[PDB]
């Protein structure tokens, strides 16, 4: 019906500023250290 | 009467950090180089299986 010259345009529904736009194509119209290895009792203990 | 160092939350101890190192890193920072890290472990290999993805700052 609406198809024009081999083009299948059929599958279409047919029934501030106020600009006007064209329809169908819109455009303007833990762990804490332990004592060892912490450097005491490694220089100490006079007993 | 007792002296209790702390009460464990979720069966863990509280995390205590060094504030001087914190300020030293924070006051001399320039970039945030981020590394994508992927963890994948099967069972018919090392015994556990676990998969995860993560991002880690290398300048940390």
HSE-up (13 A, CA, CB side) for residue A45: 5
Verify whether the Cβ–Cβ distance B15 to A30 is below 8 Å: yes
PDB experimental method: cryo-EM
| Residues, chain B | 60
Distance CA B60, CA B47 (A): 31
Beta-strand pair B50-57/B34-41 = antiparallel
All residues of chain B having their beta carbon less than 8 Å from the beta carbon of residue A31 are: 13
HSE-up (13 A, CA, CB side) for residue B13: 8
Structure resolution, Å: 2.9
Q: A30 vs chain B: nearest CA distance in angstroms? A: 5
> A35 CB near a chain B CB, below 8 Å?
no
CA dihedral of residues A19, A22, A26, A29 (deg, nearest 10)? -50
Find out whether B56 and B35 touch, Cβ atoms under 8 Å: yes
């Amino acid at each position: 019906x609406x198809x024009x010259x081999g083009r299948x345009x059929x599958x279409x529904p047919x029934x501030x500023x106020t600009x006007x736009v064209t329809x169908l194509x819109x455009x303007x119209x833990r762990x804490y250290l332990r004592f060892h290895x912490x450097x005491y009792x490694x220089x100490x203990x006079x007993x | 009467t007792r002296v209790i160092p702390q009460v464990e939350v979720g069966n863990r101890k509280h995390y205590l950090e060094d504030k001087l190192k914190v300020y030293k890193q924070a006051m001399n920072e320039t970039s945030e180089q981020l590394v994508p890290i992927r963890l994948e472990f099967d069972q018919d290999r090392d015994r556990f299986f676990l998969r995860d993805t993560l991002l880690w700052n290398k300048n940390d």
